[PDB]
Amino acid sequence: FKAERLRVNLELVINRLKLLEEKKTELAQKARKEIADYLAAGKDERARIRVEHIIREDYLVEAMEILELYCDLLLARFGLIQSMKELDSGLAESVSTLIWAAPRLQSEVAELKIVADQLCAKYSKEYGKLCRTNQIGTVNDRLMHKLSVEAPPKILVERYLIEIAKNYNVPYEPDSVVMAE
Amino acid sequence: FKAERLRVNLELVINRLKLLEEKKTELAQKARKEIADYLAAGKDERARIRVEHIIREDYLVEAMEILELYCDLLLARFGLIQSMKELDSGLAESVSTLIWAAPRLQSEVAELKIVADQLCAKYSKEYGKLCRTNQIGTVNDRLMHKLSVEAPPKILVERYLIEIAKNYNVPYEPDSVVMAE
């Protein structure tokens, strides 16, 4: 298969990973001053949704870094496992997590479309329609938490609002039922 | 991280600390003659608000000197703790007080923005959003008093007015309920 198209794809993935990380950092700083505005100005719940979007983004940041490590370590053993024909256990975790998150990351990046195709084009043993679904069970559970879509515990969203109000110097009063939870 | 940008930042912090200390001293002398005017001229309560601003400033002066000692002692062990990766107990008090007062001092100085970022960039153990909030509990309580925003006891504001009237030779009569308090 097109393994150097795959490789330069990965390189662009890494480049855009860095770029998107940086851009989202920038706008996240602006948005944190903005959240200081919303919290300072009335609807802390509006700021609560804003910071929900932000903590979502931060889950994405952490997941981005984890998978950046994964694509880079897979890139290390390009020719080596390319000599092989099945995936090894040393890369089974990375491959499983990547295969699992790839559909979640299909939209975020178009290179990864080809990266996943070439992955599945690379293997059939524990690879394919369901065989890939069988081998993908070794996905990183930590990334899974960093890729879980949920409301954080309102004690923790309150703590994010508290540490924001700390860092950004607004008055925040958590809901004591949740501030105790 | 940018630890020499941090270092020259600290140097500018110290320079402006000295400069602002000197400037506020100068204008405070002028303002003390001015307070002698207001006390001499009618509204001692107007002078009372003026000297409230001044004693506030003096709390800032004392806090400035304390933290000047703190930044300089941290500067002593720049490379040493830089070799380390977590903060030591020998600097835990200074770091906690600095981290705690930094948001209060965010506005006073723009270098300290970076100084706090690099601080948090220096550590994660008892550092971060709430971990830094956890480790900051070792702040100087004396500085905390020198950084507490409160009305002094009116026996003491009366004593400041009395010792001003002493030094500046105006007639001051404290409110005997407070002059006894």
Side-chain angles (χ1 to χ4, degrees), chain A residues 1-42 45-121 123-124 128 137 140-174 180, chain B residues 1-42 45-121 123-124 128 137 140-174 180:
Chain A
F1 52 90
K2 289 302 298 296
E4 185 58 26
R5 171 167 157 240
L6 172 63
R7 195 155 211 188
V8 303
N9 271 40
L10 278 140
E11 292 154 21
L12 296 179
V13 165
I14 293 154
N15 299 2
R16 76 180 67 259
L17 271 172
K18 299 151 165 172
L19 290 160
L20 214 59
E21 164 184 348
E22 292 148 0
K23 290 189 295 288
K24 83 199 297 193
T25 299
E26 294 166 354
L27 60 91
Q29 180 42 70
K30 319 313 172 213
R32 273 195 306 283
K33 184 55 61 180
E34 189 271 297
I35 277 163
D37 310 344
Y38 280 179
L39 281 176
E45 183 55 64
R46 192 68 149 78
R48 199 162 293 111
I49 307 296
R50 286 303 320 122
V51 75
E52 180 163 14
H53 285 95
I54 291 291
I55 186 61
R56 186 67 65 220
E57 288 293 332
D58 308 343
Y59 295 163
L60 315 184
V61 174
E62 295 152 302
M64 270 204 303
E65 300 307 318
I66 297 155
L67 60 89
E68 201 145 28
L69 267 288
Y70 288 173
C71 84
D72 213 64
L73 68 90
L74 290 158
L75 189 65
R77 299 178 187 168
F78 176 74
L80 179 51
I81 202 74
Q82 188 180 24
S83 178
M84 261 293 286
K85 304 188 173 183
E86 306 177 353
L87 59 91
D88 75 321
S89 60
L91 307 166
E93 173 58 52
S94 290
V95 164
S96 46
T97 316
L98 260 64
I99 283 169
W100 165 73
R104 279 73 180 169
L105 273 296
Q106 268 174 7
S107 43
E108 286 80 330
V109 52
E111 312 310 325
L112 190 143
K113 307 304 292 297
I114 305 161
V115 182
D117 305 322
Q118 304 288 91
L119 265 176
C120 298
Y123 311 108
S124 73
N140 185 18
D141 63 334
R142 183 263 305 285
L143 188 140
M144 196 172 208
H145 161 259
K146 268 71 175 180
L147 202 51
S148 62
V149 182
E150 85 306 343
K154 296 294 105 174
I155 185 71
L156 187 63
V157 188
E158 279 157 343
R159 274 175 294 177
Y160 290 155
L161 296 155
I162 282 155
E163 65 91 16
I164 280 162
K166 169 180 175 292
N167 297 357
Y168 296 89
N169 297 89
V170 302
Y172 180 66
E173 269 62 34
Chain B
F1 52 90
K2 289 302 298 296
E4 185 58 26
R5 171 167 157 240
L6 172 63
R7 195 155 211 188
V8 303
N9 271 41
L10 278 140
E11 292 154 21
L12 296 179
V13 165
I14 293 154
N15 299 2
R16 77 180 67 259
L17 271 172
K18 299 151 165 172
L19 290 160
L20 214 59
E21 164 184 348
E22 292 148 0
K23 290 189 295 288
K24 83 199 297 193
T25 299
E26 294 166 354
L27 60 91
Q29 180 42 70
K30 319 313 172 213
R32 273 195 306 283
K33 184 55 61 180
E34 189 271 297
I35 277 163
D37 310 344
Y38 280 179
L39 281 176
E45 183 55 64
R46 192 68 149 78
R48 199 162 293 111
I49 307 296
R50 286 303 320 122
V51 75
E52 179 163 14
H53 285 95
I54 291 291
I55 186 61
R56 186 67 65 220
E57 288 293 332
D58 308 343
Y59 295 163
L60 315 184
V61 174
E62 295 152 302
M64 270 204 303
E65 300 307 319
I66 297 155
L67 60 89
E68 201 145 27
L69 267 288
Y70 288 173
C71 84
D72 213 64
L73 68 90
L74 290 158
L75 189 65
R77 298 178 187 168
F78 176 74
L80 179 51
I81 202 74
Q82 188 180 24
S83 178
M84 261 293 286
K85 304 188 173 183
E86 306 177 353
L87 59 91
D88 75 320
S89 60
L91 307 167
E93 173 58 52
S94 290
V95 164
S96 46
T97 316
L98 260 64
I99 284 169
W100 165 73
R104 279 73 180 169
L105 273 296
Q106 268 174 7
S107 43
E108 286 80 330
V109 52
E111 312 310 325
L112 190 143
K113 307 304 292 297
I114 305 161
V115 182
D117 305 322
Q118 304 288 91
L119 265 176
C120 298
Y123 311 108
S124 73
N140 185 18
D141 63 334
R142 183 263 305 285
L143 188 140
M144 196 172 208
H145 161 259
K146 268 71 175 180
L147 202 51
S148 62
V149 182
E150 85 306 343
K154 296 294 105 174
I155 185 71
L156 187 63
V157 188
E158 279 157 343
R159 274 175 294 177
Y160 290 155
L161 296 155
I162 282 155
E163 65 91 16
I164 280 162
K166 169 180 175 292
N167 297 357
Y168 296 89
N169 297 89
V170 302
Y172 180 66
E173 269 62 34

Coordinates of all heavy atoms in Angstrom, one line a residue, chain A residues 163 166-167 169, chain B residues 103 106 129 133, unseen atoms left out:
Chain A
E163 N -11.2 27.5 40.8 CA -9.8 27.8 40.5 C -9.7 28.8 39.3 O -8.7 29.5 39.2 CB -9.0 26.5 40.1 CG -9.5 25.9 38.8 CD -8.8 26.3 37.5 OE1 -7.8 26.9 37.6 OE2 -9.4 26.1 36.5
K166 N -10.3 31.9 41.2 CA -9.0 32.1 41.9 C -8.1 32.8 40.9 O -7.5 33.9 41.2 CB -8.5 30.8 42.3 CG -7.1 30.7 42.8 CD -6.8 29.2 43.2 CE -5.3 29.0 43.6 NZ -4.4 29.2 42.5
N167 N -7.8 32.2 39.8 CA -6.9 32.7 38.8 C -7.3 34.0 38.2 O -6.5 34.9 37.9 CB -6.6 31.6 37.8 CG -6.0 30.4 38.4 OD1 -5.7 30.3 39.6 ND2 -5.8 29.3 37.6
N169 N -10.0 35.9 39.5 CA -10.3 36.9 40.5 C -11.8 37.4 40.3 O -12.0 38.6 40.3 CB -9.3 38.0 40.5 CG -7.9 37.6 40.9 OD1 -7.2 37.2 40.0 ND2 -7.6 37.6 42.2
Chain B
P103 N -1.9 36.6 42.1 CA -3.2 37.1 41.5 C -3.5 38.5 42.1 O -4.0 39.4 41.3 CB -4.3 36.1 41.9 CG -3.7 35.3 43.0 CD -2.2 35.3 42.7
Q106 N -1.0 40.3 40.1 CA -1.1 40.2 38.7 C -1.1 41.6 38.0 O -0.4 41.9 37.1 CB -2.3 39.4 38.3 CG -2.1 38.0 38.1 CD -3.4 37.2 37.8 OE1 -4.4 37.8 37.7 NE2 -3.3 35.9 37.8
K129 N -3.9 23.6 38.5 CA -5.1 24.3 38.8 C -5.4 24.4 40.3 O -5.5 25.4 40.9 CB -6.2 23.8 38.0
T133 N -3.3 25.3 44.0 CA -4.2 25.8 45.0 C -4.0 25.1 46.3 O -4.2 25.6 47.4 CB -5.7 25.8 44.6

